[PDB]
Every structure is written in C-alpha cells, then in structure tokens.
Design a protein around this nucleic acid. Structure first.
Ligand code: CL
Ligand code: K
Ligand code: K
Length: 52
DNA sequence: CGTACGTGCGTTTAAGCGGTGCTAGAGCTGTCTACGACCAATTGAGCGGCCTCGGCACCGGGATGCGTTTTTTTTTTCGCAGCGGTAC
C-alpha cells in the first residue's frame, strides 16, 4: 500500500520515474532496463549540480 | 638582409611481399532465467492560480583611478665662446 518514489530509492532529486517514461515514449528502444532511468537521472542531477 | 628550406646524389633502412605455422577469439547454436512489458487500481507528486516583500535596476552625487595635454624638470648630448696650463 505505501509507495516510495524510485528517485528516493536511489537518493536522487531527479525523477527516475519521468526519465523511465520519457525513454519508453522517446522511441529510443523497444525495451528499457529498470536501472537505466536511475543511471540517467543520476548523471543528469550530477551535471545539473556541477554547473549550479 | 639573413637564413631556412628545396633539390639531388649518395648511404642506411626496413617496408613490402608471399608464404608458412599456431591459436585467440568471433560469432553461431540451443537451453532456461531473469527481467521487463502489460494491466489494473490506487495514490500523492507536480502543475497552474493567487498573493507578498526583497533583490535588483535605477538614479543622482561624490570618489578613485586612468588618459590626455602640456608644463617643469632631469638627464643626456652637442656646439660656441670662454677658460688655465703649454711653449717659447
Ligand atoms: Cl537496467
Ligand atoms: K575470428
Ligand atoms: K536473463
């Protein structure tokens, strides 16, 4: 019943959920692994901080 | 005006070739596992309205430093007449 947001499970502020959707609806591939969005929201957050 | 390329002829090298010998590693087949797509339902994260108050652009009014001229000086750099010692 209690739904923790994946972004929390990675300790990322970047939305690992919205990254997963954007990828599947991006037409990048047929199938997205479940680590991929994590890995990507991570890298995104990181470069966001590096500039900020 | 100075010099560092360019040509070319002469030595040094090692690339290229064709063939031979050994073996990693490419790249396929079959099997089976784990992982991810799909669905449904349930949520709260995230978005479009409101309503401040404070960070920012502004403004005018001196203050610091930066460039221009042009005035006064310091240092160097010839040139003319006015010396002190030779010479006799
Ligand atoms: Cl993955
Ligand atoms: K091979
Ligand atoms: K597998």
């Amino acid at each position: 019943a209690k739904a923790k947001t994946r972004s929390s499970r990675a300790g990322l502020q970047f939305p690992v959920g919205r990254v997963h959707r954007l990828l599947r609806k991006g037409n990048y591939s047929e199938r997205v692994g479940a680590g991929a969005p994590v890995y990507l929201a991570a890298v995104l957050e990181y470069l966001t901080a590096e500039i900020l």
